[PDB]
Amino acid sequence: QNPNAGLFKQGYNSYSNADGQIIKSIAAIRELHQMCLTSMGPCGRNKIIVNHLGKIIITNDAATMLRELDIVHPAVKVLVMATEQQKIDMGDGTNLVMILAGELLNVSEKLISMGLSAVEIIQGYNMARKFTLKELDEMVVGEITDKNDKNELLKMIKPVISSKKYGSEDILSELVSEAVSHVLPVAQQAGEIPYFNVDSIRVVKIMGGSLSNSTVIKGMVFNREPEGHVKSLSEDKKHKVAVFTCPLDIANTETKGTVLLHNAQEMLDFSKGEEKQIDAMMKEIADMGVECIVAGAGVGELALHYLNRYGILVLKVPSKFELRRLCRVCGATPLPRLGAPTPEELGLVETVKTMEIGGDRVTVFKQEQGEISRTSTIILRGATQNNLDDIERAIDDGVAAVKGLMKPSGGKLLPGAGATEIELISRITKYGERTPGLLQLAIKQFAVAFEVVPRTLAETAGLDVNEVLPNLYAAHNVTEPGAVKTDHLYKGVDIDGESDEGVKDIREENIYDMLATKKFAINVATEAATTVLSIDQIIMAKK
Amino acid sequence: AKTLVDISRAQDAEVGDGTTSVTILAGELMKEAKPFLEEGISSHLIMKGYRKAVSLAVEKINELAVDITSEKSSGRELL
């Protein structure tokens, strides 16, 4: 009896700005905004998620969690798609993009209720974004020389491990930086040819031990068994490795070729035929100097018997992704046939041995000097499986941080730990009074939206908001008796954890944020909030 | 609560004794932190308060634990 006005389409869902859906869309994001507020920072924690298949995934990274969560509202999917922009390109800063984009909608909610048009809200952020991009170039304090030294890598990697896993940042930094120096060649002042990739560092784990007992290998590490009576090869230089896609067995016909026995006469011929043919093919491989054979397919019973007499190490890698990284080290190439070890396609390994690390004997793959490897692997050890899986996800974020050292402003850095977001407030408000017109409302609120980063770090650390926050404003804003500002520009936001009064200087712990990561995160978070504010209506249909 | 079961399986593996006591101690420590949440105390200082207490406990256990070889004993008389 009671009609409904405004919907002429169908019984599907129609979201219009008349009832304030733009506020409800932010409220739905606000529910997931506080989710990321419990993630970023050293006080954050991983979330336990059980898949529909009965699998438990535990990770601290929020961008990975978004892939494991079911998103209903399509307005959140825009932020999820914008979050992947930060994870795919720079690989770091996903927490800075999602939290800021959620706060840009919070400060815009006060402008919508005030009566300010959403078009002038977007126009204000577009003008404030160009004002921020010009300041980020002048806010650079130090610059990474790209020396690729182990001590120089500890400066960038330490804050990357920070706000993910706390207390292990001293041990994990030496493990990650050691593997980076192994995959990087010797060069300087050359940005033409890229070197470091994201697959150059493999992460393996084993139960037992601790993080202090972990080591770093210069090449791929295999946790499986040698599958033969030969445990390891010798120490001789430049061992030959052959990768075979064809399985190890008597040569057959590509079409069918199933062995059948009609009579006992064919039994002695086919049994001895497999013995003479395989031994003849394995002998030609051993005569060429190949002490290691990589079999991508299954291995027969008679094949393992002859490889033990010739002293050839058996290796089986069914995964094609591991074979690609194997070609980058020794130079071997998979051969479509069996018994033809062409020396041009063969690889060279300096040292390959089977050693016991973490309680179990594993056969690793590494080098010494020649045949420089572009791929390395870090062996992790620990007594806690939950924290062990979290380090695996934390190293992957550190691998992408090394990639940010390339030509697009890789050396420049900005002070982190809340020091950058607060300093942007005084610089943007300086341009607020400079730009006349209605843009002053959106420009001032754009700088206030940066207060969520220092407030979240102080709230999760147990510090009083009424105490640390007014000290943060007085740290970046001071009155100097002179024309040139001086003394401390290094005052950041401190997590404490033991005790302190006021704040601390960033120069003590050398916690810095890359310019390429921060400048790219602001543009993504601005365009993400621009899309949400530009949508005043959402049309959906039931599935 | 699966974490209490996971640490109990590691308690029976790496050690073998105290599988029941490690969960009760972790649960009672959780019960003592219940009034801390009602008063508004954040979990950061709660973690750092217990981690410092355990650090002072291990240093005290080493003083309480008596392992002697050449001091007023030998490898036999002690046993």
UniProtKB/Swiss-Prot annotation, chain A:
GO-annotated biological processes: chaperone mediated protein folding independent of cofactor; protein folding
InterPro entries hit by this protein: Chap_CCT_theta, Chaperone_TCP-1, Chaperonin_TCP-1_CS, Cpn60/GroEL/TCP-1, GroEL-like_apical_dom_sf, GROEL-like_equatorial_sf, TCP-1-like_intermed_sf
NCBIfam families registered for this protein in UniProt: chap_CCT_theta
Keyword Nucleotide-binding: yes
Family: Belongs to the TCP-1 chaperonin family.
Native species: Saccharomyces cerevisiae (strain ATCC 204508 / S288c) (Baker's yeast)
PANTHER family given in the database record: CHAPERONIN
Oligomer status and interactors: Heterooligomeric complex of about 850 to 900 kDa that forms two stacked rings, 12 to 16 nm in diameter.
A GO CC annotation given for this chain: chaperonin-containing T-complex
Keyword field contains ATP-binding: yes
UniProtKB keywords: ATP-binding, Chaperone, Cytoplasm, Isopeptide bond, Nucleotide-binding, Phosphoprotein, Ubl conjugation
Protein's UniProt name: T-complex protein 1 subunit theta
From Swiss-Prot, chain B:
Signal peptide: none
Entry's localization field: Cytoplasm
Domain of life: Eukaryota
Disulfide bonds: none
Role summary: Molecular chaperone; assists the folding of proteins upon ATP hydrolysis. Known to play a role, in vitro, in the folding of actin and tubulin. In yeast may play a role in mitotic spindle formation.
Description of how the protein assembles with itself and partners: Heterooligomeric complex of about 850 to 900 kDa that forms two stacked rings, 12 to 16 nm in diameter.
UniProt family annotation: Belongs to the TCP-1 chaperonin family.
The protein's name in its UniProt record: T-complex protein 1 subunit eta
Species annotation: Saccharomyces cerevisiae (strain ATCC 204508 / S288c) (Baker's yeast)
Source species taxonomy: Eukaryota, Fungi, Dikarya, Ascomycota, Saccharomycotina
Full-sequence portion shown in this chain: 80 to 158 of 550
